[PDB]
Design a protein around this ligand. Structure first.
Ligand SMILES: CCN1CCN(c2cc(Nc3ncc(-c4ccncc4)s3)nc(C)n2)CC1
Ligand SMILES: CCN1CCN(c2cc(Nc3ncc(-c4ccncc4)s3)nc(C)n2)CC1
Lengths: 309, 309
């Protein structure tokens, strides 16, 4: 199951997705696998893993560079092998942006498929926030500046994705990475996350889904849109200003939970969210998708708050 | 006593200082004092203080901006009034640099002299470090990235000063400010610090001097050079990687202290200084001033460590 989808047409409220198996792979990305030295495993699911590695001569012929390599475990079946190749083709289709985990190369010959991406040295944003949660005015002001910056950067990364007609479908702090300079990068662990052991992914129908992050139109109609990604961004803002607390606290995903969300029930503001960031969340959680803001508009709104400093 | 001196000639190991009272003041800096609204006091000495204020229409005609205003207290005498004006003239002589507290304007008519500079919103680096001292691998790595950045930025600020033939004479973490984006800015509180109540300033001769930060040639010959500023930067590095501990721990400034420093005694490395930053400190503490590195060279050395990431 390819996670990032790419739309080609909107034929009056119905998306025409592009078959990722029909996207090109440009051999400019090809890199010899014997110039990768594999290190620790950074994440692993049932069928896939991401491993830290050193790449010799990937960018400059005389330099080594730390990278992340996505690969399948031997237990993987054909559909997982296709998905890895489709993720490779989507990533090269997207192109490069500062706030996404970028493609650096690939090994598609001489062994199983390897996908080489940037390595983010501080790990996932969710764990970063929860450490600061477990852990005076100047210190709090500086933390608020970081959180404003993270929301700005994720919003730019998502605006870049939407500009390439790409829908993320699993936006959440656990899928955002932090790296040098406090730069945040959107990624998808996809096959490299063990979702069977993550309570945030819930059984609904024939899938395990991050329901507390999903828009209502996605839960009752299984549709994923640019507007539903905006909804997820709103949920992301709530965990961001709550220091990584899980959304809808003390409320498990029952059938009771599903009722409330169609009743227009929303979360209240996190205690220390700035009013104008709370205002952005609420508009992301509009029951009407076409009343939610676009990521381009969210970028402008957050730019204005940061400039007021 | 003007703190920042400006040299004009080096006539074989003897400096010709420029009389700051002979530097021009350009009226382009003139700003009406009735467009300042004064707030809290940020620091105060015997004769002077620095106050936070809002300046209406200072940069853009339609915008307010937070600034810092240096001014004298009524107890000030003629020599302090001249010094404030000389500091104004040095600051406009220096020009603008990202890593110094820059001049934004001045009120030299219609009341006592006011000097308007950038406001740094996180205060002094020394208190910032001591809070982190009172206060796992990802968190420590990120702290080390900040400390590397602070040493790089202070070194660029000092290289800019040396390039303008300016000697600071009181470089220390207490004279470095932190502001938005974790930018550090060199300043001098000068008349706005109460040095009578600061143990770091010690009675030597007819002055109160920061002896633990001074080069030996400055202690026994009362000479201040570009090379003695480099010495102070080395001491600054030691407090930086020690999280604001006072230099030469458990050793008061006796006559015994003076003996040891001419004996070539130096501090050992802070426990978590990177080897290459320790190497920079040691070279800053060379008994021969002409064997110390220049700030231009320190900038290059630290740039290389940061690039290795
Ligand atoms: C020693 C302390 N730590 C702990 C944790 N720590 C990290 C780093 C990290 N870096 C990644 N870079 C790219 C990734 C990726 C690429 C493509 N698709 C999906 C994911 S994951 N990821 C994790 C989960 N933990 C690093 C150091
Ligand atoms: C509410 C919590 N705090 C605590 C402390 N805090 C600050 C800010 C600050 N900002 C400065 N900007 C320029 C300065 C200057 C200009 C010219 N010459 C010398 C100095 S001092 N300075 C201090 C000492 N504390 C700010 C907020």
């Amino acid at each position: 199951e390819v996670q990032w989808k790419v739309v080609e047409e909107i034929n009056g409220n119905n998306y025409v997705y592009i078959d990722p198996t029909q996207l090109p792979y440009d051999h400019k990305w090809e890199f010899p696998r014997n110039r990768l030295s594999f290190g620790k495993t950074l994440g692993a699911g049932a069928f896939g893993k991401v491993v830290e590695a050193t790449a010799y001569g990937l960018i400059k012929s005389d330099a080594a560079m730390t990278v992340a390599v996505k690969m399948l475990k031997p237990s993987a079946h054909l559909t997982e092998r296709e998905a890895l190749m489709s993720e490779l083709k989507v990533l090269s289709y997207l192109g490069n942006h500062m706030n996404i985990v970028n493609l650096l190369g690939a090994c598609t010959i001489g062994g199983p498929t390897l996908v080489i991406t940037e390595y983010c040295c501080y790990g996932d944003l969710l764990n970063f926030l929860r450490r600061k949660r477990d852990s005076e005015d100047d210190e709090l002001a500086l933390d608020l500046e970081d959180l404003l910056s993270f929301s700005y950067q994720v919003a730019k990364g998502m605006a870049f994705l939407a500009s390439k007609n790409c829908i993320h479908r699993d936006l959440a702090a656990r899928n955002i990475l932090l790296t040098h300079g406090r730069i945040t990068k959107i990624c998808d662990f996809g096959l490299a996350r063990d979702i069977k052991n993550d309570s945030n992914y819930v059984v609904k129908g024939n899938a395990r889904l991050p329901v507390k992050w999903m828009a209502p139109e996605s839960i009752f109609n299984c549709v994923y849109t640019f507007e539903s990604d905006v909804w997820s961004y709103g949920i992301f803002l709530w965990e961001l200003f709550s220091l990584g607390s899980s959304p809808y606290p003390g409320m498990p995903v029952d059938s009771k939970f599903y009722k409330m969300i169609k009743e227009g029930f929303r979360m209240l503001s996190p205690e220390h969210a700035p009013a104008e960031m709370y205002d952005i969340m609420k508009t992301c959680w509009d029951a009407d998708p076409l009343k939610r803001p676009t990521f381009k508009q969210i970028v402008q709104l957050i730019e204005k708050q940061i400039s007021e400093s």
